[PDB]
Amino acid sequence: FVIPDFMSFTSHIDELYESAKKQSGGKVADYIPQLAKFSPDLWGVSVCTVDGQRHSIGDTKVPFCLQSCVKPLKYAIAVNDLGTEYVHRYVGKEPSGLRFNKLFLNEDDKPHNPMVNAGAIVVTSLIKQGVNNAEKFDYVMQFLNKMAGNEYVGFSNATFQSERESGDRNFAIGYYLKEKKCFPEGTDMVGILDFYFQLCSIEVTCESASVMAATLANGGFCPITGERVLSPEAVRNTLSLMHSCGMYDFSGQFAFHVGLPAKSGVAGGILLVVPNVMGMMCWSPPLDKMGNSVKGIHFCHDLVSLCNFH
Amino acid sequence: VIPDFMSFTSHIDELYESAKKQSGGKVADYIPQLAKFSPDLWGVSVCTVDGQRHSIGDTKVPFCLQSCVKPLKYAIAVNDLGTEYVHRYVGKEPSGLRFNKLFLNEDDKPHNPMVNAGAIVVTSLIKQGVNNAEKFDYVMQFLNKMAGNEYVGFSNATFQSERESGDRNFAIGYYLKEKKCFPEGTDMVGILDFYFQLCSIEVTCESASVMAATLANGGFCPITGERVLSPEAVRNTLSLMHSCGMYDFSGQFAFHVGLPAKSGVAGGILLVVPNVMGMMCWSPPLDKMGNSVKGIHFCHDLVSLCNFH
Amino acid sequence: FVIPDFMSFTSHIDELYESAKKQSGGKVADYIPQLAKFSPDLWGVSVCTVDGQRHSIGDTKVPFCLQSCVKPLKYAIAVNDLGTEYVHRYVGKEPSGLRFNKLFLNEDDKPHNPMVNAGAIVVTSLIKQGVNNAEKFDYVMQFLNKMAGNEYVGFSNATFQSERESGDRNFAIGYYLKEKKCFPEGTDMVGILDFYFQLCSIEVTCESASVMAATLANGGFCPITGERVLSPEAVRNTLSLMHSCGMYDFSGQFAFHVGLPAKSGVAGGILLVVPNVMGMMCWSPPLDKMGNSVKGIHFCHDLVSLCNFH
Amino acid sequence: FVIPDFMSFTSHIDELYESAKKQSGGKVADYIPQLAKFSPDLWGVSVCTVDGQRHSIGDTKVPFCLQSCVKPLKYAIAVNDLGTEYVHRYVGKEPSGLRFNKLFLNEDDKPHNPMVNAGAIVVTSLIKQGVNNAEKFDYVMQFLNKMAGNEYVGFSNATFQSERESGDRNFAIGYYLKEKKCFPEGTDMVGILDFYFQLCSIEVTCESASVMAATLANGGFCPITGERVLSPEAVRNTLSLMHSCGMYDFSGQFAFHVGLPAKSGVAGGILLVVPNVMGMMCWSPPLDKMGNSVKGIHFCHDLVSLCNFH
């Protein structure tokens, strides 16, 4: 009952879709063939409110991997499993002010936030200590399936292989973290990076990602099934981190124009959450210079200019 | 707004006693005019957007708006000129370092209007081409309109000490001048003098609470009802305060309180609850990082008790 | 004598001069009109051996300001007056590794070396404490006249006026040093900066600068007059500093190719010292991208390639 | 003979040795037991002139590993085999001004100098591209045997095993270099790091290291055998690099006090070269805060205070 029209709202959504469809685009990957095979013409939007209302426009049935949209999810899982005090004992909560792949730590020799690469690696290490990687992956997959309301969540072996054979910057970051002793006692760095690469290669559709964001919007209760999947503290911390450093150094400027918790991925996916209202996923393979889809950014700006929100 | 300014005032009056039982740290000691206030001073003022007021403690002792004037001067500049002209010279993103760091962003511009360089540049943008007397008169009239004709004054004793001890500010000003970060036809020394004058404007907790309430209301003074600021100006000011209001601590603050708050070196915390109220907390004691211990404790207790956030 | 013949050597120097004259050049000043009015065709070389032997080629009678070639001389004056332990109580003796006009101090909150701008400002603050600028300038000028063997040393007021109204970076450095308590007790920063600007404006010809370089190479004894002007410790420390960080971030590369104590100024001047052998001055307004005279650098490279020295 | 008496010189050497023997010492390793098993009382000095004159006092027949004293040797080998213009195409020649194990490159995305860890890794990569590690090790060992005049040069398997499983900072540096494509085409980073660890574990005696330094002092001609082992350009570049950044950030300060090309290892070894005169090795397990032997530094300071040298 939060938006009891879903007729003019969807009309405006389609209008914004058509308006943003006119954008040319940009380079997508230019470094690997796995992400360079997607044609730039693909562009889809999926909206899911906190009541179960759903609306998909464009091509929302084409699966794509969650490159950087899984960091809030893994952080929420870690917080729910362990607790805020324990999970923030190893990582910070302030924005670094530099690029996401820079090799440096704060004054406490800890990663600045769970959104940067080092913070993501540490948070991945924190999950299910002293267990085989297969069990960790099964646990994360079942958690994602429960969070998405039993929608389509799958694995992309080719993408995982490409990342594991191309991502040596993450290996440098992991070795640097191991040297500074930022990991919990009794962990294997190579296995941690393998699990991180496996997590980054999980693929979803636009509707499934919209439901996943709507779960965070609702406050840990799935809008479809109604089952409690996350504690309120985990959702609150995830939203705070996404609002603070969701888009890295650009994030603050984003908060100046859109002012919503959103996360951007390499695969051209923008996952945004309007708290107590709804969640959206916008997929557009073409990317701009700083690693964000031009169509997704244009759609978000047009939406925040149209409706009040913010 | 609050149909319980009776029991709500009781909650405020119990958080006041909860935060009073603290020892804390130092006061300031950088200028003699601020290392004089007794550590036991502790006051809270609250003004809702509907005009209801409530104060408890030492809310009638004037104190300088050392670093709490940056949001107000930024709002004045944006209202006078506009968002696109104001941000043509300063950025809108956090720097990730201390407020007095001598470095610019990738575009050779100050990172945000909250650091010292950004504050100086924004000060350079107010009432261009006029002498300092008229600039100060304009700013004081704007502040009087902002506070609903409450107590706003000037502390010359603080201004003289601050003016002769701002070596870092002079270095920042010369660095900005060398990098061509100022509008054409500006005297840097006069800009720094006007900055020192602005930092020395003193208010009580009542007037600061009214200013926070009028920021919460959207440019409309809760008491008088006169529109003083444009919606764009107050929206941008709130966004900047939420993003980088507490400098490198800001994110952590947003992790716990999640409200737009600004902290001064005179032990003042000006916090805004949008569409709800505006509050001012004064406690001259400061911790190791530069915030009042009593004010921070009060903010944490308030956000733990009431939902807000 | 150091050069038993001094006839073949003069022919070699002349042919090196002719070879270096063929260079085109670059920009000259671009920041002040006093140093930007010099025509690129000016190119002169002066040589003075430690035994008094002299040789001048080209237009060496045109005065020019000692912009940044006065730092070794002022450091030598300060060390001779005060002592190594007192002088280095305020400045370091190690290269910074960054640009010369960078605003940062070492781990001890002191200037890295007396060759960067901050170190030079501190050093000129250390000279003749407790006296007004007139007597300071008189003392420095008498010391320079003693160093040059009563050759031509003068003051360029137009250059001084141009500099004192355009040194914003120097003012920022001075205020930064004042804040960090890097100055001796009882000093006026503005007066120190004015004295620094006055010192940078002292002008000489190639002959006087060659005599100064020969005095440094001789161990404090002026080759012409034969009277001591500097203590051995002062000249040794000055030579060590010039070899270590004489050319700022390029210095090491210079030591990789030439391996001699050389100091470069923004007025197209190269002061070269061959210890126990001679001292040379090369003047060419044409400057390169990094702030060195193209003709002077070419002459130094060709000279070190031809003769052994070192 | 460059030293005609060689009787008073040895007497002064013994006096300096006795004077330095009174130093207390400091922590040696405190992180591994392999380097912590050496008793602090060990202290030896060996001197070899360019005429084949040898003199050693102390425990000069106790083998110890060449930890950081092998970087000049490997750089000289690479320059002699390949050429200066090709060797410096991948590494710089300027001091970085920071710690020796910092993860950053210069403005050209190259290691600052061959003395830092990244420069050493790249230099090791430059040697014998596309060849098995056994052949590379045999070539390096035979080159060291020829340079040392067929003295004792051996391998320490325990040290190599301990280093290859503890130095993750080197792995981080190698992965960072591989990300920036600082390596030559067709190289394996893991094999390069294994070869680097093997090279760092080569052990010698004080007498053999003294002969090794005297070979560089003589100018590529072994003082004992008389056979040409290195080109003059290689030894000149090695001496220039050692003088510029032999002791990393402290190096400049060293040049202010001692002013000689010296290299210091973490195994408590100082290898110093007096050009055209002699070469010395000083071994002392006791180490100071910045990673240098206290007895070695004190001996170098006393030696430079007693004789002129420089």
From Swiss-Prot, chain B:
| Portion of the full-length sequence here | 225 to 533 of 674
Question: What is the protein's given name?
Answer: Glutaminase kidney isoform, mitochondrial
N6-acetyllysine sites (modified residues):
K92
Main function: Catalyzes the first reaction in the primary pathway for the renal catabolism of glutamine. Plays a role in maintaining acid-base homeostasis. Regulates the levels of the neurotransmitter glutamate, the main excitatory neurotransmitter in the brain.
Subunit (UniProt): Homotetramer, dimer of dimers. The tetramers can assemble into rod-like oligomers (in vitro), but the physiological significance of this is not clear. Interacts with RAF1 and MAP2K2. Interacts with ATCAY; the interaction is direct and may control GLS localization, negatively regulating its activity.
Organism of origin is: Mus musculus (Mouse)
Query: Which family is it part of?
Result: Belongs to the glutaminase family.
Protein origin, superkingdom: Eukaryota
The disruption phenotype is: Death during the first days after birth. Pups appear normal and display normal levels of activity, but their activity is disorganized. Pups do not orient to the dam, do not succeed in grasping a nipple and do not feed properly. In addition, they display altered respiration.
* Post-translational modifications: Synthesized as a 74-kDa cytosolic precursor which is proteolytically processed by the mitochondrial-processing peptidase (MPP) via a 72-kDa intermediate to yield the mature mitochondrial 68- and 65-kDa subunits.
> Binding positions for substrate?
S67, N116, E162, N169, Y195, Y247, V265
- Mutating K101A: effect? Constitutive enzyme activity that is fully active also in the absence phosphate. Forms oligomers with full, phosphate-independent activity. Forms dimers with full, phosphate-independent activity
Read off the domain note.
Answer: A highly mobile activation loop at the dimer-dimer interface is important for enzyme activity. The C-terminal ANK repeats prevent the assembly of the supra-tetrameric filaments.
Q: Which residue intervals make up region (Highly mobile activation loop)?
A: 96-103
